[PDB]
Amino acid sequence: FEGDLKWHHHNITYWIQNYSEDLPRAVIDDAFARAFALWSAVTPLTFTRVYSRDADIVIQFGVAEHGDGYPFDGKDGLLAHAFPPGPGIQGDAHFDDDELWSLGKGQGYSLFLVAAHQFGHALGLDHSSVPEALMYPMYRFTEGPPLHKDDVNGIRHLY
Numbered sequence: 001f002e003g004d005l006k007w008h009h010h011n012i013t014y015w016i017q018n019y020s021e022d023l024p025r026a027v028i029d030d031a032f033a034r035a036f037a038l039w040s041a042v043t044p045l046t047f048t049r050v051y052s053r054d055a056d057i058v059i060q061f062g063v064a065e066h067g068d069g070y071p072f073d074g075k076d077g078l079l080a081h082a083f084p085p086g087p088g089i090q091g092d093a094h095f096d097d098d099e100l101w102s103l104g105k106g107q108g109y110s111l112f113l114v115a116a117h118q119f120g121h122a123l124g125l126d127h128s129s130v131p132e133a134l135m136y137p138m139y140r141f142t143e144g145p146p147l148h149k150d151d152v153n154g155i156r157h158l159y
């Protein structure tokens with residue numbers, strides 16, 4: 001997932017290729033939209049849902065081997081990964097459907113928070129060393145605005 005490029009356009013498009021069997025499609029679509037809204041709220045970036053493989057960010061829920069050199073392991077461990085800006089698989093976000101996807105307090109992992117984190121990568125952001133930042137490499141659920149000052153500065157430094 002090595003990348004040093006940023007998008008050369010601000011009108012970013014995404015395609016929800018498939019869904020997780022843990023949540024209603026309406027809940028999934030809204031979670032992704034809200035995750036994207038976090039980033040557009042502090043930048044001139046916009047996110048438009050499309051239905052084509054030509055979308056910049058292709059969102060895919062997979063299990064085990066799913067098309068790249070980093071197959072998912074299973075329950076826990078790797079929750080998801082995303083490729084840095086660029087053509088093709090670049091910019092795409094993959095989620096391990098072997099995980100229990102949920103939202104808010106309770107068991108399972110928040111699709112909202114994990115997606116927001118992954119979209120950060122798909123925009124060119126690297127991991128943060130700030131434990132409270134959304135771009136921190138370790139998952140942990142908490143309430144309140146996901147974007148930490150460190151996350152806002154990182155994204156604006158790019159766009």
Ligand SMILES: N[C@](CS(=O)(=O)c1ccc(Oc2ccccc2)cc1)(C(=O)NO)C(F)(F)F
Pocket residue numbers: 077078079080081082113114117118121133134135136137138139140141
């Ligand atoms: N796979 C990861 C770890 S991960 O368990 O899949 C992960 C950890 C945390 C994630 O976002 C997040 C960060 C803070 C709070 C809530 C959610 C998303 C994904 C990762 O950060 N992938 O993007 C790593 F570090 F590369 F191994």
Ligand SMILES: [Ca+2]
Pocket residue numbers: 040041042043044045
């Ligand atoms: Ca904006």
Ligand SMILES: [Ca+2]
Pocket residue numbers: 055056057058086087088089090091092
């Ligand atoms: Ca792509």
Ligand SMILES: [Ca+2]
Pocket residue numbers: 072073074075076077078079096098099
């Ligand atoms: Ca896993």
Ligand SMILES: [Ca+2]
Pocket residue numbers: 020021022096097098099100101
């Ligand atoms: Ca699942």
Ligand SMILES: [Cl-]
Pocket residue numbers: 017018019020
């Ligand atoms: Cl599906």
Ligand SMILES: [Cl-]
Pocket residue numbers: 018060061062063066
């Ligand atoms: Cl798949």
Ligand SMILES: [Cl-]
Pocket residue numbers: 103104105110112113
């Ligand atoms: Cl949540």
Ligand SMILES: [Zn+2]
Pocket residue numbers: 066068070081094
């Ligand atoms: Zn993948």
Ligand SMILES: [Zn+2]
Pocket residue numbers: 117121127136137
């Ligand atoms: Zn990450």
